[PDB]
Design a protein around this ligand. Structure first.
Ligand SMILES: [Ca+2]
Length: 240
């Protein structure tokens, strides 16, 4: 997250760190959202790589023991059937990971609330992006969770020519684009938390940023619209 501030520890308890084994160590590669005690929601581009992955829940500082972490392996990865690695602009950047064990819920570990199917937010809706991704374009990962206030940019504006044009589809959410704050690499797959009826719900899964850089004016961070996938999500969890 570019232009963020440090999140307090129990602020966003459904946020997970998706990591892969690198030699003898594990590196954070993407964010995710805990949606069931044994199911995490993330972007399908984060699991394109056949690597060994684990999920870290109740995490705050990646380089230090917080005393709250739970470490779990990934037992099954279910990527959206239409996801195409060579076309992220086509959408379908969503994946579900079945965890090897059920995690324990406590104040640091909670389930993310999903929106009702087909819900579309009004332009300029108050949302926050959270993650340990790069803090500057071509910079380094954050050590502690960062958060940035990133209001939505509706479809008509986001798909206009000054913004993203045709790259953005109606199955996506745009947020930010002020040239100061944004999602960045390493934030992918993580949540876009939006306040709806007094509750924060996860309306987006971080998908992409501009090729030109993370924080670029008129190039909001683009998210997979979670409300477009509620039936798919439920059909996967019910049969696996
Ligand atoms: Ca830690």
């Amino acid at each position: 997250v570019v232009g963020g501030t440090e999140a307090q520890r129990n602020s966003w308890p459904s946020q997970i760190s998706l990591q892969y084994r690198s030699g003898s160590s594990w590196a954070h590669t993407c964010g995710g959202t805990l949606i069931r005690q044994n199911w995490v929601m993330t972007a399908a581009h984060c699991v394109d790589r056949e690597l060994t992955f684990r999920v870290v829940v109740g995490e705050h500082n990646l380089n230090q023991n917080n005393g709250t972490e739970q470490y779990v392996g990934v037992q099954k990865i279910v990527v959206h059937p239409y996801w195409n690695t060579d076309d992220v602009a086509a959408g379908y950047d969503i994946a579900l990971l079945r965890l090897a064990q059920s995690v324990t819920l406590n104040s640091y570990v909670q389930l993310g609330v999903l929106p009702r199917a087909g819900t579309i937010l009004a332009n300029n809706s108050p949302c926050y992006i959270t993650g340990w991704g790069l803090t500057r374009t071509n910079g380094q990962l954050a050590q502690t969770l960062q958060q940035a206030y990133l209001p939505t940019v509706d479809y008509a504006i986001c798909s206009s020519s000054s913004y993203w044009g045709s790259t953005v589809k109606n199955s996506m959410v745009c947020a930010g684009g002020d040239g100061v704050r944004s999602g960045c690499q390493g934030d992918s797959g993580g949540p876009l938390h939006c306040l709806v009826n007094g509750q924060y719900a996860v309306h987006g899964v971080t998908s992409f940023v501009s090729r030109l850089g993370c924080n670029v004016t008129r190039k909001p961070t683009v998210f997979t619209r979670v409300s477009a996938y509620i039936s798919w999500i439920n059909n996967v969890i019910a049969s696996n």
